[PDB]
Amino acid sequence: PQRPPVIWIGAQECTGCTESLLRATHPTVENLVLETISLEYHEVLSAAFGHQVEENKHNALEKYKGQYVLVVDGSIPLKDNGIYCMVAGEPIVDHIRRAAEGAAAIIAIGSCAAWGGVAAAGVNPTGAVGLQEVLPGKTIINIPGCPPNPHNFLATVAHIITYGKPPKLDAKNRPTFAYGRLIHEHCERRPHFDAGRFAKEFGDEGHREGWCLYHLGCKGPETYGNCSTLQFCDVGGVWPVAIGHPCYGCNEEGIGFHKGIHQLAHVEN
Amino acid sequence: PQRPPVIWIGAQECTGCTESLLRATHPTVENLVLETISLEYHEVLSAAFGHQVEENKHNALEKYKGQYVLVVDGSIPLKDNGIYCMVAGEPIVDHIRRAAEGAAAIIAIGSCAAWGGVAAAGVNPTGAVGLQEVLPGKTIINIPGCPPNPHNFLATVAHIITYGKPPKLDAKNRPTFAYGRLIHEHCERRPHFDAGRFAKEFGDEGHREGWCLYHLGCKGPETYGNCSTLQFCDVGGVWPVAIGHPCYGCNEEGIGFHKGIHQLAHVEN
Amino acid sequence: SQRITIDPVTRIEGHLRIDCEIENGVVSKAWASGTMWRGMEEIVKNRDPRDAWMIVQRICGVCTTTHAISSVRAAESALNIDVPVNAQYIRNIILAAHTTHDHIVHFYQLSALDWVDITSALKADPAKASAMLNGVSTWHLNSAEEFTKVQNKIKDLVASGQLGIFANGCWGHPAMQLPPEVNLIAVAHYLQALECQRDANRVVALLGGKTPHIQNLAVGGVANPINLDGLGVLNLERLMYIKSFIDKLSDFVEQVYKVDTAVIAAFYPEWLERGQGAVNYLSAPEFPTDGKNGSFLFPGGYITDADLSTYRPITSHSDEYLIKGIQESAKHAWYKDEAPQAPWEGTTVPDYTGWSDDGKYSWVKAPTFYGKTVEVGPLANMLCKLAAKRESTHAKLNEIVAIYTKLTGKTIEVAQLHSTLGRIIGRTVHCCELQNVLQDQYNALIVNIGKGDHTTFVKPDIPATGEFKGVGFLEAPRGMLSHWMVIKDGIISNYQAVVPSTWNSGPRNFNDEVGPYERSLVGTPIADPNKPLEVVRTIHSFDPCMSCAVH
Amino acid sequence: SQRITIDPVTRIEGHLRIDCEIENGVVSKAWASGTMWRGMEEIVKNRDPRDAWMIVQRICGVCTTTHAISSVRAAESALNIDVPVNAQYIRNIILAAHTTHDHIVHFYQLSALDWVDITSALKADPAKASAMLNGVSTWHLNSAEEFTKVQNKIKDLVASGQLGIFANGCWGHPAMQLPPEVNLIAVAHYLQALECQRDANRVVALLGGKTPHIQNLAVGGVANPINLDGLGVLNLERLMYIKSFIDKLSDFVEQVYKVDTAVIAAFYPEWLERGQGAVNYLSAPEFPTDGKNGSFLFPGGYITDADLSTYRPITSHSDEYLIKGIQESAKHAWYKDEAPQAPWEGTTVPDYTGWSDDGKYSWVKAPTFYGKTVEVGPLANMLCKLAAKRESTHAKLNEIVAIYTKLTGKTIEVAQLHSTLGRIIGRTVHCCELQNVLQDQYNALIVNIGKGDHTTFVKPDIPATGEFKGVGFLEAPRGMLSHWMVIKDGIISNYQAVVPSTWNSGPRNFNDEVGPYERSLVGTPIADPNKPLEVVRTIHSFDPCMSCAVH
Ligand code: SF4
Ligand code: SF4
Ligand code: SF4
Ligand code: SF4
Ligand code: F3S
Ligand code: F3S
Ligand SMILES: [Mg+2]
Ligand SMILES: [Mg+2]
Ligand code: NA
Ligand code: NA
């Protein structure tokens, strides 16, 4: 039987989003690429290179027109006519716009593709932007995080495959099963927050009792995600706060990579 | 190289506490019995039976006197001179008293051994009691739960082996790393509790959004444990509340098996 | 005539004593005795019917889930509740995954060391051991290198002088008949089995909230909240995780467990010719798939005279023929009331008088079906399925036999299934068939959610006055389980459990007829009365659970 | 004369373009070009020094952890902070576990398909393949049955008509030299590698809080709270969990990866005779084990003229010889300031002029050490360790060579390590030695906690005025990494990263001398200019990461 085709394009990425697939367990990456989808193009894993891999892409874009899921990883640099990301001698924005034309669904994976991410932070040297800004007439499914839990992506794709439509999305086009609630509104350290039990420095008494990390700069109060529940890596109990470090707000535009680590969630300076 | 000896005696048990070992992953039960300890006596797993397994018990008591960890699973029935639990023609209370005399450490695993548990509930047909009641002069480490996460037990044994003394205990002689906090004081649904977002019936709208289960009878507010953090089975996200059912208070004397499932916290009966 | 006692019988759940009279080197008479009682039936009395399942689940943690599901089924029976079909799918997946773990653990951790000599495995050539499985199994972990790693583990254990749970077993016993190579194969698989049973329980945990002792049931359905788009609930990601573990079970079950069953049978032919416990068999249908508590995936029924042509199908948990036949007698058990009692009118009044060969000698009651002594369990369920001409059952049995034939050049007929090995084969067949139940029920859940049904729970009405009776049947790993609840004025006025090991381990009944364990031992040859391995082999084949038997 | 271009180069991280001039069928000149820039050095400017690591870790998610640890080390250097020894143990475990995942994925997922033909695997006799490894490896997953399962997966993939990421690979290429049986072995190990690397990352996750991109660091130590008696923190149960995954890595590394390295060498011996990238090699010491940022488990050093007797050891991260030698030039890179700059004085001002063969042609800067080109990475680190007479490195190398000699009857001399295969061998040796680092550091942590030391963090004093300069070195999976921070009036006034792939992939330098990639390609024969597999093989041997190279 035939597997649904996926085309994966990397723009200004660090490859963390692809790497997240190597931690996935349901499905694992091997079951993903052999059983669940047909990964028609991915530069990190493709046996083919150079002229042959672009041949694969063209062949895929034509063969599966109207049926492939397009995934974009990384921000798109607008400054100086797109030259800050050139693949096969062409600005990545042109590759993306061409692929978007025949896509059945388009997913921006990671905060960079979702909203600019770290590449768009500070003075934004390359004029990096998110995918929706490059494809204004298209419906983009945003799966933010740096990187997101891979299953936030995989369960979205599974929903498209199994039930023939995207999952329910919020106002920012993020799937509600993963981004429908603030981390702070489903965090196991909320009782400590409520009581006033706060860590003040790494290694202090409260920190060593697993108290709330608000006053270390936790951005959970202003970040949507499932980090406190789904967590990471499927071993149980693993997310940044559980390990002892505040949420940095990497899911959330204007928080992650903008606010200082130890800047408080109610502080906007 | 030699391994620390362990003698495991089952009294009025359902075998759930032994079964918990089969879910463990650090160590797995095979690494436990081959590498971590020498399980000198355990009736569920022992190749020997009858006269031969009793020979094993006697030989181990003599060979390892002063060295072994004694583990007792199940309540001890005091009514009618101990006849409600007889092994090899002798009341289990005598097997336990005999083994306790030469133990390096004694652990009551499960709520039954810790405080009488389900066997001592209702009218208590057999005069079931916990281990400390049977051994008033001895220091008993209590590891309650029905059954506890197996690593609550395994990490306690590891502390004894590695550092040469038990872990820090609370006023009820329970290891603080596992029982030092109320479940409600480290529960991820606390934000919902705070906001008055309550499930009222299984399958209702709030229940299907993961709201707080207080009004379904959750005993988290009066139960000490690590169910919300360590959780169960090491797959991530698995504990009764996360699955959608209130805590029943199985860890806690006077809560589990005494109060109705849907009876509210702090309400007596 | 020599009298022997085995106390404790190990590698079972709970506390069991077996006594045997031996004449001319063969068991002539036997007694089975449950030696621990808790009074679970009395503990649960006078409570809200909704509360029962959390308490009576604690009858047993080996067969966790089973009493929980049977209890809610009993309350649902009493209250006339139709369980939502999604709750059935979820209950079914839990029971099937649990039973997979249960059977695997029974064959390897509980039973294998009756048939396998670990000291003999030290003598094995790992290359020869691997070679003899060529063409027998497609399993990927039967290499000489794997067997060498395993042999070295045994060697290091033995060299240490601390054999622990493996000390003083029946090593070198004359009834140990496997060659060194096959002993090594079995020990390797014993270790590999531990990973497979862990995967089975990960399925149970993801729906139950933990295991042992699930916490997702309710009178009226389940507590899992189905919402594909919800955070923190049973959504598509969680379902995918469940499926990932379901998918990991089949290869071990088909390529290791199923194969080892045939391997053991191959070296122990006379064990297809002894160990019959009964001529009557009972099983309940199981895995309901409609919204009316019926449409079972597995049939049940009643067989008499060890003859499949007597098969009487049972296709409903409301079948009055089944309900009216069941009684228990405490004539030879340590309770006060001795006449056969229907469980809705049952009592459990302790009357401990100590051991007497001709009197009371057990905490287990003696159940009967219209007065007959009956064996329950995977042998019973297999025979009913074979009688019903269930193709999947015949096919799986035939696959086991074909492996047996490859090894021995012999075959196995239905007549030979009434035996110690037949019982073990029935369990293996059950485990194999359950893998398709898991796939089917997961898929049915996905399909039903796709049709827009997210219903999981119907809230019961418990009338404040009036008397209501219910019975919950379940085909448990060890056989037909039934919980019997009487509700009066909104609370439980009587509760009685009749458990599979109660049927099998029950003592002599009102007319002094021995129970299946006791019957099965008559005729057993005994090499060494001080080390009665042959008795233990037959008893273990029933998968005893004494906390279940006695409660 | 004939010019070919490979754009994009796949199975690397990031965006790489390679050009080659071909004369008489052989590469006569080459160009390496990084084609994507983000300006990470500019993005981190003007922030609190404590914030940098969370931002610059995003230079790369393949070598996640590395930039994070280098960044905190740079700030600690600027502020004269002694990192608590417990924080060192934790950082060391994270780096060693990550690098294990990294090297395994590089050998199999990124590199193997340069040397392995999956269509040839279809022709293999799985029994023959298994037999080949008899006495060559003790790995337990080399059975004919395992190889059959793998072969059937390949068959199903091909038969489906959707080869996906395996489509249009160099199947049937003349340079593919493995017999069908060895191709099948390699594909089986490729799949098995995925499980091992997952276990390595479970170690990283348990200390890091997740991966990719750990979140447990701090300028001053780590954010892990050590408390054996604490609920919800780093207690003994969590440490045991970490140990359970550490214990799962060594068998695959030693019995599969180490072995496959020698097997590839055996069938491709001419690849020990080409692919030299430089005559100078540089590595930093790594894994500090005291409370003063020193006492490294691995030594570093500098070697010139491909001569181990010139070895100059580096055993401190504040060695001025190392610090003072490093400059970068953008003569041939797309930046405005072209004269060599030391990183504390570095600028990164974009000046894109398009690709040209004699002008600027890359976003990668060209680093030099005392004005010379240097190769960094596992080849450099291996040669430094051999020169330092480290017994463990010699022994591990000798183990690989011994397998090679068993297969070929030939040996491998130190001269032959300056090659494409030598580079790959260095990487394998590194991975093997890291397993000892993991065990050693875990043990050290457990012991130190037992001495009553739970300290994990010292708070930085960051002066509100004045200028402070710091450099953090780290021996990353691809070689020597350094982050350079200048702090002025409490904030970052300059930040420059010089990354291992910057050294190796850098374009022609201030003296117009080619970098390691560009030099390594000269002499390479090309069977098919349209499909230049031979170029890709050599380039992959450096493990390119272009997000790292360019940042
Ligand atoms: S999101 Fe974070 S991880 Fe994914 S690409 Fe952008 S930077 Fe790398
Ligand atoms: S501030 Fe952070 S740690 Fe504290 S409760 Fe909110 S999310 Fe949890
Ligand atoms: S505690 Fe709960 S689980 Fe452990 S024995 Fe007593 S009943 Fe069985
Ligand atoms: S009542 Fe129960 S569910 Fe609600 S916050 Fe407390 S522990 Fe959590
Ligand atoms: S930093 Fe990111 S990974 Fe989750 S905990 Fe905060 S959103
Ligand atoms: S019922 Fe028990 S298992 Fe934990 S969630 Fe409550 S204490
Ligand atoms: Mg009963
Ligand atoms: Mg730089
Ligand atoms: Na026989
Ligand atoms: Na060659």
State both tokens at C438.
Answer: 């898991």
CB neighbourhood size of A80 (10 A): 12
- Say whether both A24 and A123 belong to one domain: yes
Around ion ligand 8, which residues have CB less than 5 A away?
A: D 497
Torsion, Cα of D113, D115, D118, D121 (10° steps): -150
- Residue C364's identity, in one-letter code, is V
Q: Is the CB of B241 under 6 A from ligand 4?
A: yes
The enclosing domain of A142 has a CATH number of 3.40.50.700
- Is A257 strand, coil or helix? coil
- Is D527 strand, coil or helix? coil
Residues in chain D: 551
- Say whether both B6 and B26 belong to one domain: yes
**Separation between Cα atoms, residue D133 and residue B15, nearest integer Å:** 45
Instruction: Check if the beta carbon of residue C51 is closer than 8 Å to that of residue C74.
Output: no
CA-based Rg of chain C, rounded to a whole angstrom?
Answer: 23
Residues in chain B: 269
**Separation between Cα atoms, residue A69 and residue A36, nearest integer Å:** 13
* Distance (Å) of CA D13 to CA A43, B225, C42, D60, D104: 8, 45, 67, 9, 15
Q: Which residues of D touch C143 (CB under 8 A)?
A: 130, 140-143, 145-146
Select from B147, B163, B178 the last residue of a domain: B178
Inter-chain CB proximity B237 and A236 less than 8 Å: yes
Nearest to C515 by CA among C537, C536, C495, C544: C544
Size of interface B-D (CB pairs under 8 A): 62
Q: Is D271 left (phi over 0), alpha (psi -120 to 50) or beta?
A: alpha
* Distance (Å) of CA C15 to CA A212, B49, C267, C550, D369: 48, 12, 30, 10, 76
Q: Which residue has tokens 């202090």? A: A204
Do you find a cis peptide bond into C212, omega within 30 degrees of 0? yes
Ligand 3 atom with the shortest distance to the CA of B14: 8
- Say whether both A173 and A184 belong to one domain: no
**Separation between Cα atoms, residue D87 and residue D92, nearest integer Å:** 8
**Separation between Cα atoms, residue D204 and residue A233, nearest integer Å:** 10
Task: Please give, one letter per residue, the 3-state secondary structure of D37-73.
Answer: CCCHHHHCCCCCHHHHHHHHHHHCCCCCCHHHHHHHH
A192, A209, A213: residue to mutate for ligand 2 pocket, most atoms within 8 A of CB: A213
Q: Which residues of A touch B191 (CB under 8 A)?
A: 184-187, 190
Q: Is the CB of B251 under 6 A from ligand 6?
A: yes
- Is C23 strand, coil or helix? strand
Residue nearest to atom 6 of ligand 5 (CA): A247
Instruction: Check if the beta carbon of residue D31 is closer than 8 Å to that of residue D518.
Output: yes
Inter-chain CB proximity B234 and A229 less than 8 Å: no
Inter-chain CB proximity A48 and D232 less than 8 Å: no
- Element housing C301 (H / E): strand C300-303
Nearest to D162 by CA among A71, A54, A9, A64: A64
Inter-chain CB proximity C140 and D139 less than 8 Å: no
- Say whether both B9 and B78 belong to one domain: yes
* Distance (Å) of CA D542 to CA D259, D424, D482, D517: 20, 8, 18, 8
Q: How many domains does chain B have?
A: 2
State both tokens at C197.
Answer: 């049973």
Do you find a cis peptide bond into D460, omega within 30 degrees of 0? no
Instruction: Check if the beta carbon of residue D242 is closer than 8 Å to that of residue D94.
Output: no
Instruction: Check if the beta carbon of residue D283 is closer than 8 Å to that of residue D300.
Output: yes
In chain D, what are the domain boundaries? Answer: 1-551
- Say whether both B238 and B139 belong to one domain: no
Residue nearest to atom 2 of ligand 5 (CA): A250
Nearest to C100 by CA among C293, C245, C260, C222: C245
* Distance (Å) of CA D407 to CA B265, C185, D64, D120, D411: 72, 31, 37, 21, 10
- Say whether both B142 and B29 belong to one domain: yes
Q: Is the CB of A225 under 6 A from ligand 5?
A: yes
State both tokens at D431.
Answer: 């991975």
Q: Based on the number of CB atoms within 10 Å of its own CB, is C491 exposed (0-12), middle (13-18) or buried (19 or more)? A: middle
Nearest to D230 by CA among A71, B175, B2, B211: B175
Nearest to D127 by CA among D212, D82, D184, D69: D184
- Contact residues for C133 (Cβ-Cβ < 8 A; gap 6+): C139, C142, C185
Q: Is the CB of B218 under 6 A from ligand 3?
A: no
Nearest to C369 by CA among C279, C495, C297: C279
**Separation between Cα atoms, residue A19 and residue B169, nearest integer Å:** 42
Instruction: Check if the beta carbon of residue B21 is closer than 8 Å to that of residue B157.
Output: no
Q: Helices C258-267 and C180-208 meet at what angle, rounded to 10?
A: 150
Question: Quick one: closest CA in B to D237, which residue?
Answer: B155
- Say whether both A167 and A202 belong to one domain: no
Q: Which residue has tokens 């702070």? A: A184
- Residue A255's identity, in one-letter code, is I
**Separation between Cα atoms, residue B51 and residue B49, nearest integer Å:** 6
- Is D275 strand, coil or helix? coil
State both tokens at C505.
Answer: 């381990």
- Give every strand in the sheet of B105-109, ordered side by side: B38-41, B5-10, B69-73, B105-109, B140-143
State both tokens at D91.
Answer: 């950082």
Beta strands in chain B (DSSP E): 5-10, 38-41, 69-73, 76-77, 86-87, 90-91, 105-109, 128-129, 140-143
For residues D73-91, b (16+ Cβ closer than 10 Å) or e, as one string?
Answer: bbbbbbbebebbbbbbbbb
Instruction: Specify the CATH architecture of the domain C1-551.
Output: Orthogonal Bundle (1.10)
**Separation between Cα atoms, residue D73 and residue D482, nearest integer Å:** 9
**Separation between Cα atoms, residue D296 and residue C290, nearest integer Å:** 67
State both tokens at D50.
Answer: 């404590």
- A:22-41 residues touching chain D, CB 8 A cutoff: 22-23, 25, 28-30, 33-34, 38-41
Q: Helices B150-163 and D236-246 meet at what angle, rounded to 10?
A: 90
Instruction: Check if the beta carbon of residue C165 is closer than 8 Å to that of residue B47.
Output: yes
- Say whether both A123 and A18 belong to one domain: yes
In the Cβ-directed half-sphere of D304, how many Cα atoms lie within 13 Å?
Answer: 6
Percentages of chain A per state (helix, strand, coil), in multiples of 5: 35, 15, 50
The enclosing domain of B188 has a CATH number of 4.10.480.10
State both tokens at B180.
Answer: 């030092």
Q: Is the CB of A227 under 6 A from ligand 2?
A: no
Instruction: Check if the beta carbon of residue C103 is closer than 8 Å to that of residue C477.
Output: yes
- Element housing C22 (H / E): strand C16-23
CA distance to partner chain C, nearest, from residue D141 (Å): 6
Select from A144, A161, A178 the last residue of a domain: A178
**Separation between Cα atoms, residue A267 and residue C308, nearest integer Å:** 79
- List, as one string, the DSSP characters of C469-525: EEEEEEEETTEEEEEEEEEETTEEEEEEEE-HHHHHH----TT-PPPHHHHHHTT-B
Residues of D acting as catalytic residues: 13, 60, 63, 67, 478, 501, 545, 548
- Say whether both B168 and B47 belong to one domain: yes
State both tokens at D349.
Answer: 């001002």
Ramachandran angles phi, psi of D475, nearest 5°: -90, 95
Instruction: Check if the beta carbon of residue C369 is closer than 8 Å to that of residue C515.
Output: no
- Contact residues for C194 (Cβ-Cβ < 8 A; gap 6+): B22, B28, B29, B30, C108, C109
**Separation between Cα atoms, residue C242 and residue C253, nearest integer Å:** 18
Q: State the Cα angle at D79 between D73 and D81, rounded to 5°.
A: 65
- First-to-last alpha carbon distance for chain C, in angstroms, is 34
Residues of C acting as catalytic residues: 13, 60, 63, 67, 478, 501, 545, 548
State both tokens at D357.
Answer: 């063969």
CB neighbourhood size of A91 (10 A): 20
Candidates B20, B26, B141, B170: best to mutate against D (most CBs of D within 10 A) is B26
Instruction: Check if the beta carbon of residue B132 is closer than 8 Å to that of residue B125.
Output: no
Residue nearest to atom 4 of ligand 5 (CA): A227
**Which domain does B241 fall in, by range?**
179-269
* Distance (Å) of CA D425 to CA B128, D106, D192, D388: 66, 12, 20, 18
Q: Which residue has tokens 């979140």? A: D215
Nearest to D68 by CA among D91, D101, D45: D91
Chain centroid offset of residue D494 CA: 26
- Say whether both A158 and A191 belong to one domain: no
Ligand 10 centroid distance, CA of D404 (Å): 14
Q: Is the CB of A219 under 6 A from ligand 2?
A: no
A190, A197, A209, A224: residue to mutate for ligand 2 pocket, most atoms within 8 A of CB: A190
**Separation between Cα atoms, residue D225 and residue A207, nearest integer Å:** 6
**Separation between Cα atoms, residue B139 and residue B135, nearest integer Å:** 8
* Distance (Å) of CA D195 to CA A25, B262, D187, D550: 10, 44, 14, 31
- Say whether both B255 and B158 belong to one domain: no
The experimental resolution of this structure, in angstroms, equals 1.6
- Say whether both A139 and A219 belong to one domain: no
DSSP A263: S
**Separation between Cα atoms, residue C238 and residue C227, nearest integer Å:** 10
**Separation between Cα atoms, residue B264 and residue C174, nearest integer Å:** 61
**Separation between Cα atoms, residue C403 and residue A197, nearest integer Å:** 65
Inter-chain CB proximity B242 and C223 less than 8 Å: no
Ligand 2 atom with the shortest distance to the CA of A190: 5
- Contact residues for B86 (Cβ-Cβ < 8 A; gap 6+): B92, C15, C35, C36
**Separation between Cα atoms, residue C365 and residue C327, nearest integer Å:** 10
Select from B178, B207, B239 the last residue of a domain: B178
In the Cβ-directed half-sphere of D215, how many Cα atoms lie within 13 Å?
Answer: 24
Ramachandran angles phi, psi of B219, nearest 5°: -95, 10
- Contact residues for B126 (Cβ-Cβ < 8 A; gap 6+): B12, B75, B77, B78, B79, B84, B85, B119, C37, C38, C39
* C387-392 long-range contacts, CB within 8 A, separation 24+: C387/C301, C387/C303, C387/C308, C387/C309, C387/C311, C388/C299, C388/C301, C388/C311, C388/C313, C390/C299, C392/C433, C392/C436
**Separation between Cα atoms, residue C178 and residue A141, nearest integer Å:** 61
* Distance (Å) of CA C92 to CA C169, C203, C297: 38, 12, 10
- Residue C290's identity, in one-letter code, is D
